[PDB]
Structure 1
Amino acid sequence: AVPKKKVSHQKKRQKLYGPGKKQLKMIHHLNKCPSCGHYKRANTLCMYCVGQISHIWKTHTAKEEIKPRQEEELSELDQRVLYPGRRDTKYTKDLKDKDNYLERRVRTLKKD
């Protein structure tokens, strides 16, 4: 149930790193994407090219934003009177800074 001794430096290290099962393997199965000449996984789509195509689809197949007439044709002063500004909470501010906590996809290296 309980360790009888302080496990030594040797014995913890040979346990962890000695076996190949536990080690990380080289990703030999990279290959060139045909659409953009960059690294991608074998039997896998290029995340750049499919992302680009998804973006294209979004730009074309776009549901139009609903802008109400009455709010679109308000005067500036009138709009200010109706819908004044406010102090956002700390939480709200944190939520707004998305680049702090949201990871954009990185581009791979160009294949040789």
Structure 2
Amino acid sequence: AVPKKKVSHQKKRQKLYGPGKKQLKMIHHLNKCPSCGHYKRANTLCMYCVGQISHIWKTHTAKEEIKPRQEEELSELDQRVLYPGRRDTKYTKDLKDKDNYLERRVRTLKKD
């Protein structure tokens, strides 16, 4: 059930980094993207190009932002009177700063 002795620095090292299985291999399998000569994994669509395509689709197949009929011609003063902007809670604020906790896809290097 339990270790009989403190495992020596050597022994643990050799258990961990010793065998091949436990080592990270080098990703040899990667090649040029036909559309823009950047690196991409083999047998795999380039993540930039596809993303771009998706974006374009979104732009084209964008749904109509259903803006209400009343609020478009609603006086600024009137609006202020109606809907005064409150202070948001800490949690809400945190949620809002997406950049802090949310990751945007990185771009690869150019293959040569």
TM range (shorter): over 0.9
- CA shift for structure 1 position 47: 0.1
Counterpart Cα distance in 2 of 1:24 and 1:90: 41
Match of 1:105 in 2: 105
RMSD: 0.4
Match of 1:22 in 2: 22
Instruction: Flag structure 2 segments of 5+ consecutive residues without an equivalent.
Output: none
Aligned residue for 2:31, secondary structure, equals: strand
Q: Once the two structures are superposed, what CA deviation does each residue of 1:3-47 show, in whole Å capped at 9, x if it has no partner?
A: 000000000000000000000000000100000110000000000
TM-score by length of 1: 0.99
Instruction: Flag structure 1 segments of 5+ consecutive residues without an equivalent.
Output: none
The number of residue pairs the alignment matches comes to: 112
Counterpart Cα distance in 2 of 1:104 and 1:85: 30
Counterpart Cα distance in 1 of 2:72 and 2:84: 16
- CA shift for structure 1 position 85: 1.0
Counterpart Cα distance in 2 of 1:23 and 1:55: 38
